[PDB]
Ligand binder design. Structure first.
Ligand SMILES: CCc1ccc(/N=C2\S/C(=C\c3ccnc(Nc4ccc(C(=O)O)cn4)c3)C(=O)N2C)cc1
Length: 249
């Protein structure tokens, strides 16, 4: 429906595996949004075409305030364009870097926001979203927005996905643990200098806490980071968790 001639392109906002995202404005309405540019040549030399277009026509039907919206899309001769919600306050990564680590209120708040977004995805049968801080954006009121493109790094993957086995909903509860830890500590709990070592650290579930992490947070993270998926909580139970309810908004 749309065309490139409909939009005025602005400053760059980020670069992903598949393309660059620019700030953009639609002329008729003056609507501010983000526009992504994917070269269909680059897509077909990695063999990723149509693998993603499934997710494109899925994302389209995912309306939730803690998930970045995909308004629509179109293609010219040599390229493909995605019209997406623009998140004013940038990535959670950029924010985590400035501050080093987040306090418990900000952290629990993001975990609540994440949980609701994931609980929503799971109701719509969408499983395993890549929620690295680099893929988390911040809306105008500092509200978290899940913004990934997957359907490299092991840091957020649970044992089952790295060890080849089948997985379910509860993958996303491991990730919440990894992120609850990374928000408070500043570094994910299984970080290492090599792929091969992170693999072991994740497999053997070898994480430790700095002195400053509270016993309530040690509890939640410990609950979320279980090798056996069955043992992990439900998202309801995470939102119910005392440490969360105490500090969250
Ligand atoms: C909706 C489905 C979707 C999700 C993610 C996608 N991939 C993206 S989005 C993106 C960046 C992006 C999208 C929307 N809003 C912002 N907001 C920002 C970013 C940076 C700054 C800043 O540093 O000053 C300020 N605001 C950034 C991206 O880089 N990729 C790969 C593509 C489609």
């Amino acid at each position: 429906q749309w065309a490139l001639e409909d939009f005025e392109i602005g400053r760059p906002l980020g670069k992903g595996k598949f393309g660059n995202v620019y700030l953009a404005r639609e002329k008729q309405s003056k609507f501010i949004l983000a526009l992504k540019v994917l070269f269909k040549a680059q897509l077909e030399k990695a063999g990723v075409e149509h693998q993603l277009r499934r997710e494109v026509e899925i994302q389209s039907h995912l309306r939730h305030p803690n998930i970045l919206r995909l308004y629509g899309y179109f293609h010219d001769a040599t390229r493909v364009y995605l019209i997406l919600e623009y998140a004013p306050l940038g990535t959670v990564y950029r924010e985590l870097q400035k501050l080093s680590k987040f306090d418990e209120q900000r952290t629990a708040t993001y975990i609540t926001e994440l949980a609701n977004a994931l609980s929503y995805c799971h109701s719509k049968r969408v499983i395993h979203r890549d929620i690295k801080p680099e893929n988390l954006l911040l809306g105008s009121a500092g509200e978290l927005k899940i913004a990934d493109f997957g359907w490299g790094t092991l840091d957020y993957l649970p044992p089952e996905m790295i060890e080849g086995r089948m997985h379910d909903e509860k993958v996303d509860l491991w990730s919440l643990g990894v992120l609850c830890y990374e928000f408070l500590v500043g570094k994910p709990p299984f970080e290492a200098n090599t792929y091969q070592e992170t693999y072991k650290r994740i497999s053997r579930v070898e994480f430790t806490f700095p002195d400053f992490v509270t016993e309530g947070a040690r509890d939640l993270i410990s609950r979320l980071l279980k090798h056996n998926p069955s043992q992990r909580p439900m998202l309801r139970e995470v939102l119910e968790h005392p440490w969360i309810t105490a500090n969250s908004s």
